[PDB]
Amino acid sequence: VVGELAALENEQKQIDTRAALVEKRLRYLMDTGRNTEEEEAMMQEWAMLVNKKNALIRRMNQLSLLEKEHDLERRYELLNRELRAMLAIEDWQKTEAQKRREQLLLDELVALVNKRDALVRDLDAQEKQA
Amino acid sequence: TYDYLFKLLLIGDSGVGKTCVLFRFSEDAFNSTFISTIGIDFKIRTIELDGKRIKLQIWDTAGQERFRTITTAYYRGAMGIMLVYDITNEKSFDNIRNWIRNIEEHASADVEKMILGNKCDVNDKRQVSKERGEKLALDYGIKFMETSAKANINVENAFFTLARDIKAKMD
Ligand SMILES: Nc1nc2c(ncn2[C@@H]2O[C@H](COP(=O)(O)OP(=O)(O)NP(=O)(O)O)[C@@H](O)[C@H]2O)c(=O)[nH]1
Ligand SMILES: [Mg+2]
């Protein structure tokens, strides 16, 4: 659904430029007090266009967090298979730079689990506000 | 899309069955292959317990000695801990009291612990009887279950009891 998320970013650009073309009109029709007929019609569109923007943002939030979760999991799954192959080689066979290379691979692996944990922590603070 | 998030932790010696117990709970399968955990991992499974949606974040520690300073950083903020031994391995049951002292030196004060005697399908290699796992956890004031990740004995029961003991404590 990668082609959906790029389409929703331009759908959001269609929404808030229509919403910017509505809010200056609805301010001018209220401050001058011009037409009460097109003031009822502009308020039900602007309430629709704000609630359509809010439903499009929170679906774009849950698609962006799922895309980051999929990318961090496949980077974790790759780096774990590289580390399993490195740690199966004995200590005396590799060089001293290659032993400190696999320590950095281990630190990067703990960093990826903490990044995946941060997506869990961020989704926990998002749902209690929603 | 859920109600509450509970942080769980699995600790114990290498080879007792920590990853296999989590793989049974989160994906309903069993691996025969010893694939040792490197550092630290977690798995998510969202359950339906008592009409309520509970996501479980269950951290899986590497039991080897070379990863033990990484796994000590994950004790704080665990809401529930499984201490796993192997019922076919006398020394891993003996090491549970070292893991008890590793919990109480690093974890939170109110964390709910539970001892799992894993590999309870392997009767002909049993070195630790079921009565001795029952008396040790009753001594610690702690629930006990004999599990088998291979035979799917009491795995889902262990996690759903540990989340029931968390959710009753919120009430
Ligand atoms: N018969 C039997 N074998 C089991 C059971 N659980 C795990 N095993 C076997 O025991 C071995 C170790 O399992 P594993 O889950 O890797 O243990 P671990 O505690 O996660 N190891 P580590 O701390 O190094 O990551 C594997 O070969 C697995 O197939 C069980 O319930 N029954
Ligand atoms: Mg493991």
Side-chain angles (χ1 to χ4, degrees):
Chain A
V1 278
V2 195
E4 182 178 342
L5 187 61
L8 294 199
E9 284 185 17
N10 288 125
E11 182 172 335
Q12 193 190 359
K13 192 50 181 170
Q14 177 47 238
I15 281 170
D16 60 358
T17 47
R18 188 158 174 88
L21 279 179
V22 155
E23 55 107 296
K24 264 168 293 229
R25 293 195 34 88
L26 189 50
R27 177 238 304 272
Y28 141 82
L29 263 118
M30 220 289 107
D31 297 1
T32 68
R34 188 162 225 95
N35 187 21
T36 62
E37 210 170 43
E38 287 220 0
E39 262 228 283
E40 185 61 51
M42 224 62 74
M43 196 67 225
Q44 304 293 147
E45 161 153 343
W46 189 89
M48 176 210 56
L49 283 182
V50 161
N51 279 325
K52 200 181 292 180
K53 186 189 181 64
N54 291 337
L56 206 61
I57 278 172
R58 281 192 305 273
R59 202 179 158 83
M60 273 174 51
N61 293 343
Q62 81 182 11
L63 285 178
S64 185
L65 190 129
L66 188 56
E67 196 174 18
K68 275 183 63 191
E69 201 176 54
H70 285 179
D71 177 76
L72 286 181
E73 274 169 12
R74 62 113 206 176
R75 276 164 65 198
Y76 175 75
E77 183 191 350
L78 165 86
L79 187 62
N80 189 258
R81 289 186 205 274
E82 297 184 352
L83 253 182
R84 184 192 308 160
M86 283 207 75
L87 290 183
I89 266 85
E90 307 277 357
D91 147 76
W92 60 91
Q93 281 217 271
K94 27 201 177 198
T95 55
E96 207 63 38
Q98 282 285 112
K99 280 213 299 110
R100 250 66 231 108
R101 183 171 170 272
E102 92 188 335
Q103 184 54 57
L104 288 174
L105 261 62
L106 180 57
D107 304 353
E108 194 180 7
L109 195 76
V110 176
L112 286 173
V113 186
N114 294 325
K115 279 179 190 80
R116 290 162 50 202
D117 182 43
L119 294 183
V120 172
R121 286 180 185 266
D122 290 15
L123 185 53
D124 208 53
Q126 188 170 42
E127 281 218 354
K128 55 176 58 253
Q129 219 62 46
Chain B
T1 66
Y2 64 94
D3 308 77
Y4 280 112
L5 153 77
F6 303 159
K7 167 159 170 187
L8 299 194
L9 185 71
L10 317 157
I11 77 175
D13 293 359
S14 179
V16 302
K18 291 183 291 300
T19 297
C20 277
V21 152
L22 183 49
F23 188 54
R24 176 57 82 179
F25 176 64
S26 68
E27 257 145 326
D28 209 19
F30 172 72
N31 289 327
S32 65
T33 314
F34 187 29
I35 308 172
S36 206
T37 309
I38 307 166
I40 193 85
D41 202 358
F42 68 91
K43 296 299 198 48
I44 303 294
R45 186 204 170 158
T46 309
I47 69 181
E48 313 247 4
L49 169 82
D50 296 326
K52 177 193 187 296
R53 296 256 247 111
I54 297 116
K55 98 143 56 200
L56 290 161
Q57 188 189 34
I58 303 155
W59 292 78
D60 185 22
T61 62
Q64 297 177 344
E65 182 78 27
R66 66 169 295 144
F67 301 120
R68 207 154 289 167
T69 28
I70 302 176
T71 63
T72 41
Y74 292 96
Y75 278 83
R76 68 169 200 207
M79 296 157 73
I81 303 184
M82 308 291 204
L83 301 96
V84 193
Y85 69 100
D86 185 346
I87 68 141
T88 78
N89 190 336
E90 175 110 342
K91 309 207 190 273
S92 62
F93 175 70
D94 284 317
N95 284 333
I96 282 303
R97 69 178 78 79
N98 292 332
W99 292 116
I100 281 288
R101 289 188 291 254
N102 206 225
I103 283 171
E104 287 152 352
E105 280 166 12
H106 298 292
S108 301
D110 50 352
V111 62
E112 256 169 321
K113 307 178 291 291
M114 199 203 279
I115 290 167
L116 306 176
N118 198 30
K119 313 195 186 167
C120 78
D121 52 292
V122 196
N123 278 120
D124 69 346
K125 302 204 80 212
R126 172 185 290 275
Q127 289 176 13
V128 187
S129 66
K130 193 211 202 180
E131 61 182 335
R132 291 167 53 201
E134 269 157 20
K135 293 173 297 191
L136 204 255
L138 180 57
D139 167 69
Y140 279 143
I142 284 313
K143 284 185 182 168
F144 179 67
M145 330 250 303
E146 274 199 348
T147 61
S148 169
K150 175 189 184 48
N152 193 27
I153 288 170
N154 276 323
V155 173
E156 274 222 3
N157 192 20
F159 286 103
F160 276 52
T161 313
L162 201 70
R164 194 120 44 178
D165 296 323
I166 288 308
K167 204 238 280 210
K169 205 172 55 206
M170 310 193 55
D171 217 302

